[PDB]
Amino acid sequence: VGSESWWQSKHGPEWQRLNDEMFEVTFWWRDPQGSEEYSTIKRVWVYITGVTQPQSMQRIAGTDVWQWTTQLNANWRGSYCFIPTERDDIFSAPSPDRLELREGWRKLLPQAIADPLNPQSWKGGLGHAVSALEMPQAPLQPGWDCPQAPEIPAKEIIWKSERLKNSRRVWIFTTGDVERPLAVLLDGEFWAQSMPVWPVLTSLTHRQQLPPAVYVLIDAIDTTHRAHELPCNADFWLAVQQELLPLVKVIAPFSDRADRTVVAGQSFGGLSALYAGLHWPERFGCVLSQSGSYWWPHRGGQQEGVLLEKLKAGEVSAEGLRIVLEAGIREPMIMRANQALYAQLHPIKESIFWRQVDGGHDALCWRGGLMQGLIDLWQPLFH
Fold this sequence. Notes:
By secondary structure, the chain is α/β, with parallel strands linked by helices. The protein contains 10 helices and 16 strands. Its main location: cytoplasm.
């Protein structure tokens, strides 16, 4: 116990079913600073997305082994991280009200890390690494169940925008070999380097639920740009349509039918995607919005989003749009903004794929609604 051979047998969280409908899960973490005599580390918080009154892990005394044991639904899937910290003044008061939590986690997350023993760990969105946890009854995810390595790899270029005054990476991936539908994916870096979307796109076209398509993944660059360009920015989409699509056409030709062009985003990208179809239905007729930030730009839920306001004012219309609209239950405020947007899209409820899902504000949940959405929106291609 604590020995190197004891650790070599450990490759991530272990679980065993307690009910038919509950699992017991245990996490391990090996302290790199040894036992309590030499180690700077007093607490190790486990921060589960969707789930997280807070508990640290527990040191078996005289070893480098920190351990923790919880319970998660047999159908539960989400990501987590560790936060080993030198300070145990945070989260010492027996039960915090909310303010203390926001504040507490605010100071800790900087130190967040993935689980070094868990293979399924990536560099994620909010500035720390996370790891992946899936439980046995977890709802199937199209294509992720079956990575089939791609035949030809995706093309990484550098789009130099004259309009935006920046450059960014773009990835061009073609499934199908000789009018391919186009799909623009925002947060491109992520679906390209964090959770390579390729082997998934290959498998699903291979087993013929995705048509041979062309995919363009656009770098968000950084948080400031993403915070300026994704949320309701006309210039971004004009640059895309004028400079990027044309540049892509030379590399990988796609159809110009709107009813088979897709824009797919999450959070700010979800907002962005809807904004793309609302304003340019002649170019983007397919909208896949997951966990879309329809509160923007108002923190609180006090005011409706700009985009919602703008529908209410009939300043914009959602004519000629098939849209997939997805939001989790474990993300309370986004769900309310999304069902509020749904209600305001009463007129075209016919051409909307409404999906209230199990999951959270989680790249591990989104990835399966991403694939399902593509399938839902391109199904008319198999008439």
